[PDB]
Ligand binder design. Structure first.
Ligand SMILES: Nc1ncnc2c1ncn2[C@@H]1O[C@H](COP(=O)(O)OP(=O)(O)O)[C@@H](O)[C@H]1O
Ligand SMILES: Nc1ncnc2c1ncn2[C@@H]1O[C@H](COP(=O)(O)OP(=O)(O)O)[C@@H](O)[C@H]1O
Ligand SMILES: Nc1ncnc2c1ncn2[C@@H]1O[C@H](COP(=O)(O)OP(=O)(O)O)[C@@H](O)[C@H]1O
Ligand code: BEF
Ligand code: BEF
Ligand code: BEF
Ligand SMILES: [Mg+2]
Ligand SMILES: [Mg+2]
Ligand SMILES: [Mg+2]
Ligand SMILES: [Zn+2]
Ligand SMILES: [Zn+2]
Ligand SMILES: [Zn+2]
Ligand SMILES: [Zn+2]
Lengths: 343, 334, 360, 367, 362
DNA sequence: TTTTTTTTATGTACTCGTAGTGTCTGC
DNA sequence: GCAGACACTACGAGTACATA
């Protein structure tokens, strides 16, 4: 199949529509834009029957009704949309979609939307059946270092100027949330018809609505970005993420840090990273952490995390969030927490 | 499940009480795990539910015995945690209680048996309370625990207790050596670790527990003279973490007790190891490590779903901190 | 109910209950006069009698003679309550009907007139296990029920009860029974059942009941089922795991002298003879308590302390009270943590090691 | 005629008979007098301090025959049913019994229908903190812009459970727990109106026993009347409460700080002869120690209910150091921690007293 | 007579009567005056800050007889009609009440019909975060290809509860919580537009206690007028707030750090007059001390949760050495550990505060 | 790029799909 | 007379959330 990027989706649809489009990714904005572009171009090329059909395991499975039957009124080409689950299809859904792709009209267009699918769902019979004709487009959130270029491109799309301070402010405020970023760019365009966005305007026209995942918090702690770490913890508190997920995501990397610091005094880091199965993007990260924090801070952090987990699963307390902030302070940065936040 | 010789007196006595119509409806067994806990309960239930023409023995020809052997009788309720759970939910208890008001399908007596009364959640025990106090005339209960005190106090009252005496240690060694072929000192150690209760000591050899214990002993022999208590995490993190923690606690207790020159030792199979533990650790440090290990073992068992990796890693790091000179040891507290 | 005690021996008249003079007086004076209530809450520890006093009040309220202090006895609308063939009464074990839907069903069937009797009496046993929404549902009805319905609540402890439910009810606290009351009631039962009994074994049973009468009855039944079908001192001593020798005092002396080998050989021999560990600790605390009492006045030699006076006298002369208090505190902490140990023997070993380390 | 519970016989029937809560009564009467009638009231506060009674009185004031009158003019026709609870328009909603949203929807559907007789169809929603979240959200808009002929009176114990978007659009009246003097005076009035003899110390104990409520106080008084022969006497109150009055425990603490073990054990024996719970003795002694600490820190901290021993209080306030007070309090607190695990509760209390005696920092036991 | 509540009669009717929130009013004005109007606006805010009022004003502006303008005339029959509850084209849907898809279908099928009077059939769906999943699917199907003659106006309190796909098709205007100065200014205007005397300190207290929402401020203003005998005096508002104060934590910790024994006693008595669980009070006091010790380490520790008590907290962080905070936390923790075994929870928390007060000063 | 994800026991609602029942009509 | 046609009521499940 064709694997494609959101920028080149316009060219791919322009050269010719394929049997089915699999638009996948974690962000809402790029998925929505790609789906809108596909729908508009299909309507230009003669697709009028548009169906939105959620896949989620429930009492909703009758998509076959819309494909086996030719349209009596007009020879109107149809478009079917599927909203994959938050974790992808299961085995039953895998085989059901395999049956769905077992028969498809040439005039029927298939749209599937969902999060990224690992190899477990990639090697399923449904995807392998789709592997010939369908075009899959990946839409992923640019990283915090990649956001400014994307914001500059979006500003050029709307004929806007932001200099650099406004770009940094927008990236910080709407980090990991491209939907709100595009909506805010539209809002700024509406606010000032001049289009010359500057700090004394974007400062008050912006929100704090941000999105995050525990990996961002763990990496912020590892680099020692104190303000970013506390910002992520506050945003996750507002979002209502499960504290246990944060606990486990930190615990994995903290156990890795403890073991690597234990082994550092005898073995070079090049062999240790290979033996411990560390990702290539994190090596330098780990290096910095190992060269920054001694085993005393690591043991204090382990004691703190142990107290946090025990008070979470035994006393049913609500002091978890402040305690994780204390751990953030005690991790790479300034270790004080004297008994106060050290058990 | 297998029959034990030492169970024969108790069984007889209890069944002799039941045949006369004088035995209490609610019986709470104090048998240690691995002892005649389930075998006795099954024998009594099988005698009670079906006919008793032969007296105290089993009348296998009757339909009741056939259903027991098939495990499909409708008047023989078993309260057990499901495969995917660990504790005993209150839903099963409530459903069994509702079923109890129904008259016996076979017209005989009814029996409700819980696999282990300690596994009950508080709501489950509270739900059983009313039926235990005032049960239907055809019903008899059977509870199984290691520790009656761990149960709810009100439930521990309604149910008449009964105790199983661990066999004398020489009798236990004689019985164990018959079907288990190990060294006499190793056999004695395995018996003592199981509080003198056979089966469990047999379970240490039958399963893979003994190899894990030997690996733990090797790891301690490697770690203690170097003060590097880490690398024990591999030997301790396991689905049987409480058991291996108890093994470590027994080793520490043996070291501390031999420091006072006591006559008998819990860990006799490895005298050199406990000797090394005595040599390299101060008595206060040994006592502190023992207390911390026992406390974290209780933490592992009590609270549910706790990530053991973090707990054992923290315990080992704190032990390494304790071994460093100039460190204030904790005080046992209320 | 063939020979199970504490089930066939439920009290049936106010004159038959044991102790509870204050609660019985209050209820009798309320029944005799017009001082009736719509929410009585009997709270107290296990086996002091919550459900029984509740049932006696229900019988007294719905008797044909009317509102009477002492229940009649022989009648239909009392024998039906005793046998459970009741229709004006509603017994609900709240620990099983925790669901708020069942409580709302109950509140839905509160307006209906009783089939017989003057009061529809709702006996909610084990109140504290009701879910919070069920409690809030019962709150309004308890505040101002119809004149023909009365609620009776019994709970092992009022702490779990929402404080509003407390502020709605008349609280009667059933005090735990003393040793003498339990001993008298057990002797009365055994006399009325023609069962051989011995005063010392009776005293041991009363002591081990810890102030809960149902425990005393259950222990008597355990003794009856054991032994030779009769209550005897030897059988009760054997089954209770009690110690009647000077092993406790020898252990106290060895621990005071910190003689490690002897103080551990004592525990090894005790395990060989199978002495129950909780009782051994309790006697250790008793002996230390007698030490501390003597340090104020030698008359606080417990009577003549059997025949071993000298020893404790000697001990009362050799140890400062500070170390005695330290040993008592350590032993008590060990007794608290004893259940939460891999086995009781090794928990007692931990307690002894902790106690021995104070430069004994 | 007949004997009904005090908690239901003496429910206030006018703003004059509501004791305490001066701020809420004043605000309600003043607003009714001015004619400014908000369309959503929320009475918060601890249990049994009159939120339901005040709400029903507000319903009386709103629906009274003579008009919107702050003081309900005695008993008029539209107030008789309120007193009897069978009113056509005062819709009592046991919200805990109607938590489902499919019942708040039915409540909101018929809100626009005109009241049958009264000026307003006062919806009294008892225990508003129990409605399900969907029902909350349902009643949001009907609270924001209700019809001119309906009013909502919401009563609850803890407002924090309610969504803040409901706390926004309703008046928040908070009813503080009543003082001891208020409860004692109201109880004196009630026992006088019942032609029942009473003892002032007994009623002071009743006031102290109930934590600033009144229906709890009335319930405990009724239980006292049951325990006595229809009379509230000091001995009966002492028996029902399990307290030590204010003398015996003071003798205990005075002897303990004097390091005279003989009198300590003698009074322990006497208290055993008094047939009293031991943990009650410990808690009373701890409370006395805390009162000593309070008077030592704050010079004027004793209430009137302790005046009978106040002098002796000041003695200990001038004789014992704060450090010793803290030492005694912590020693007896650990004694309380350990008591349920001692071989005997009497034995445990003796050991706790002897432990406080042995670690006496001024007169310790000789070694 | 009929004194309408200040929360209703003072609802704005033109964009000029809306306080603050210029980042949304200006955007809407530019969008309406120009041609760019999106197909669905989603309004967000916090607890009575001007979502429904602005949505109603937008619906008024969209269908005014003078045309689509930023300023509605307020004179034409449409302005008067939408002003009151009755109007045909503007459909006010209490989504929080008609959550079921069965009720939503009966009103989302009206899109196929023409608007009776105005240019646009406008659906004001209030409290949209409450719909059922199937109803959300139906509304999404409507929004996918909305007719050119229908504009959707959605107002809610928690935007994140909405499914992401529906939010992706709505231009979201987030309304900022009003500032203290804006609250005080609007309250002064409201009081002066009516016959209510006042003192500026009283209005300052009202604004500070309003927690940045005009509905809270107006509700408190009506309560103050009621309890104030028709005049808003400082003492009346202060006493009422004292009856309504909930932040016993920060005030009590301020007193305890400054070691005012009498102030601690008075605050404990006040917290006993209000039914307060002592365990909860003590644990959240521990939390406040924890946050103070964190701010000792980095100024960014104090997030956006406690913006209402930022200044005071920052002051308490700046003026106190960290060691005293650690000691106070230790003694409070040990007091809470032994709290349930004290004579009374009030009694035990009192002596725990005494223990913490005996150290450092005095 | 990259793959990564957690305690639970118990109870309380809410909303949709689908069966079981009633009845009532033009069959 | 009779399905059959709703019409309605109940129940299961999927899901959200609360408390401890
Ligand atoms: N005061 C008492 N007098 C006589 N028997 C009692 C008394 N208290 C308890 N019992 C015995 O205990 C058994 C259970 O009593 P019950 O009243 O149910 O206690 P509870 O208060 O815990 O529900 C009774 O059947 C009776 O044998
Ligand atoms: N302020 C008060 N004045 C007089 N009696 C009161 C007061 N508060 C409570 N009571 C007594 O309590 C009884 C019930 O009070 P209630 O108002 O229901 O309290 P709640 O706020 O808990 O519903 C009343 O009948 C009355 O005797
Ligand atoms: N921007 C504003 N200008 C004037 N009054 C306002 C403003 N925002 C809120 N209010 C006041 O609050 C009351 C309710 O406002 P509303 O707009 O319904 O809040 P919501 O956003 O929560 O629906 C209004 O009657 C008005 O008095
Ligand atoms: F066993 Be009782 F009801 F406390
Ligand atoms: F309404 Be109250 F709490 F009795
Ligand atoms: F009406 Be708002 F959303 F409080
Ligand atoms: Mg009971
Ligand atoms: Mg009420
Ligand atoms: Mg609104
Ligand atoms: Zn058989
Ligand atoms: Zn009778
Ligand atoms: Zn009137
Ligand atoms: Zn107009």
């Amino acid at each position: 199949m064709i694997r494609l990027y959101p920028e080149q989706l316009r060219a791919q649809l322009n050269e010719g529509l394929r049997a089915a489009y699999l638009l996948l990714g974690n962000d809402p904005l790029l998925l929505q834009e790609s789906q809108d572009a596909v729908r508009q171009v299909a309507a230009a090329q003669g697709f009028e029957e548009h169906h939105t059909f959620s896949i989620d395991p429930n009492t909703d499975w009758n998509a076959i009704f819309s494909l086996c039957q030719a349209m009596s009124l007009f020879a109107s080409r149809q478009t079917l949309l599927l909203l994959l689950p938050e974790n992808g299809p299961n085995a039953a859904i895998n085989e059901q979609l395999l049956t769905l792709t077992g028969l498809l009209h040439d005039d029927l267009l298939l749209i599937v939307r969902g999060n990224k699918l690992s190899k477990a769902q990639e090697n399923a019979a449904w995807f392998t059946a789709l592997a010939n004709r369908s075009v899959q487009v990946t839409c992923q959130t640019p990283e915090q270092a990649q956001l400014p270029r994307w914001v500059a491109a979006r500003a050029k799309q709307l004929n806007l100027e932001l200099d650099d301070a406004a770009n940094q402010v927008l990236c910080y405020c709407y980090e990991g949330n491209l939907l709100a970023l595009a909506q805010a760019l539209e809002r700024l365009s509406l606010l000032w018809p001049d289009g010359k966005l500057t700090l004394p305007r974007v400062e008050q026209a912006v929100n704090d609505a941000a999105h995050f995942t525990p990996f961002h918090w763990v990496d912020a702690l590892l680099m020692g970005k104190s303000k970013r770490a506390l910002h992520i913890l506050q945003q996750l508190r507002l979002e209502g993420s499960e504290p246990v997920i944060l606990l486990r995501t930190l615990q994995r990397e903290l156990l890795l840090l403890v073991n690597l610091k234990r082994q550092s005094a005898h073995t070079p880091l090049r062999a240790l990273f290979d033996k411990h199965r560390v990702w290539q993007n994190r090596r330098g990260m780990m290096g910095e952490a190992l060269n920054r924090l001694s085993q005393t801070q690591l043991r204090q952090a382990v004691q703190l995390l142990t107290r946090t987990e025990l008070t979470l699963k035994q006393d049913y307390g609500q002091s978890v969030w402040a305690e994780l902030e204390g751990l953030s302070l005690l991790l790479c940065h300034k270790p004080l927490a004297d008994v106060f936040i050290d058990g | 499940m297998r029959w034990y010789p030492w169970l024969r007196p108790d069984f007889e006595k209890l069944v002799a009480s039941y045949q006369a119509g004088r035995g209490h409806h609610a019986l709470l067994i104090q048998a240690l795990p691995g002892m005649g806990d389930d075998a006795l309960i099954y024998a009594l239930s099988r005698y009670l539910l079906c006919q008793q023409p032969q007296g105290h023995k089993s009348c296998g020809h009757c339909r009741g015995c056939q259903l027991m052997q098939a495990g499909t009788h409708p008047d023989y309720y078993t309260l057990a945690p499901e495969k995917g759970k660990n504790t005993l939910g209150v839903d099963a208890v409530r459903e069994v209680t509702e079923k109890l008001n129904e008259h016996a399908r076979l017209g005989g007596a009814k029996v409700v048996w819980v696999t282990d009364a300690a596994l009950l959640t508080d709501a489950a025990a509270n739900a059983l309370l009313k039926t235990l106090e005032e049960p239907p005339a055809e019903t008899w209960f059977f509870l199984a625990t290691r520790e009656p005190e761990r149960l709810l106090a009100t439930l521990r009252s309604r149910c008449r207790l009964h105790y199983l005496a661990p066999p004398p240690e020489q009798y236990a060694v004689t019985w164990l050596s018959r079907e288990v072929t190990m060294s006499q000192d190793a056999l004695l150690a395995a018996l003592r670790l199981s509080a003198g209760s056979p089966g469990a000591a047999l379970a240490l050899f039958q399963g893979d527990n003994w190899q894990a214990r030997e690996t733990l002993c090797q790891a301690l022999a490697y770690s203690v003279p170097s003060g590097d208590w880490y690398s024990l995490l591999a030997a301790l993190n396991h689905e049987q973490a409480p058991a291996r923690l108890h093994w470590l606690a027994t080793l520490l207790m043996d070291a501390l007790k031999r420091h006072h020159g006591a006559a008998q030792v819990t860990n006799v199979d490895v005298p050199g190891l406990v000797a090394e533990l005595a040599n390299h650790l101060s008595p206060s440090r040994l006592q502190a490590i023992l207390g911390d290990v026992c406390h974290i073992r209780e933490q592992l068992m009590s609270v549910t779903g706790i990530n053991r990796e973090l707990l054992i890693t923290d315990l080992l790091l704190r032990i390494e901190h304790y071994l460093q000179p100039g460190v204030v040891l904790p005080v046992p507290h209320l | 109910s063939y020979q199970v005690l504490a089930r066939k021996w439920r009290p049936q008249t106010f004159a038959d209950v044991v102790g509870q003079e204050h609660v019985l007086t209050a209820l009798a004076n309320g029944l005799s006069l017009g001082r009736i209530h719509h929410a009585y809450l009997f709270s107290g520890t296990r086996g002091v009698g919550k459900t029984s006093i509740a049932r006696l009040l229900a019988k007294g309220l719905n008797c044909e003679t009317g509102i009477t202090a002492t229940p009649c006895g022989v009648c239909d609308n009392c024998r039906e309550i005793e046998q459970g063939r009741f229709v004006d009464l509603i017994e609900i074990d709240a620990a099983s009907r925790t669901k708020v839907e069942d409580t709302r069903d109950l509140l839905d069937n509160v307006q209906y007139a009783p089939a017989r009797g003057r009061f529809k009496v709702y006996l909610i046993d084990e109140v504290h296990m009701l879910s919070r929404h069920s409690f809030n549902a019962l709150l309004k009805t308890l505040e101002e029920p119809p004149e023909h319905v009365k609620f009776l609540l019994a709970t092992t402890d009022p702490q779990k009860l929402p404080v509003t439910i407390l502020s709605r009810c008349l609280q009667f606290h059933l005090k735990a029974l003393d040793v003498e009351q339990i001993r008298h009631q057990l002797e009365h039962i055994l006399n009325e059942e023609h069962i051989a009994h011995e005063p010392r074994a009776l005293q041991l049973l009363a002591r081990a009941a810890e102030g809960s009468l149902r425990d005393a009855l259950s222990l008597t039944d355990q003794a009856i089922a054991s032994g030779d079908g009769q209550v005897s001192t030897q059988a009760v001593s054997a089954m209770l795991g009690t110690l009647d020798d000077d092993q406790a005092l020898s252990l106290v002396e060895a621990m005071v002298e910190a003689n490690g080998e002897r103080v551990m050989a004592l525990i090894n021999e005790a395990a060989a003879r199978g002495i129950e560990w909780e009782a051994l600790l309790v006697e250790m605390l008793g002996l230390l308590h007698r030490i501390a009492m003597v340090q104020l006045s030698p008359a606080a030699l417990g009577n003549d302390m059997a025949a071993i006076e000298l020893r404790m006298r000697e001990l009362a002369r050799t140890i400062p009270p500070t170390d005695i208090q330290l040993y008592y505190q350590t032993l008590l902490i060990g007794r608290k943590e004893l259940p939460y140990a891999p086995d009781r023997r090794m928990g007692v070993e931990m307690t002894l090691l902790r106690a021995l380390a104070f430069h004994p």
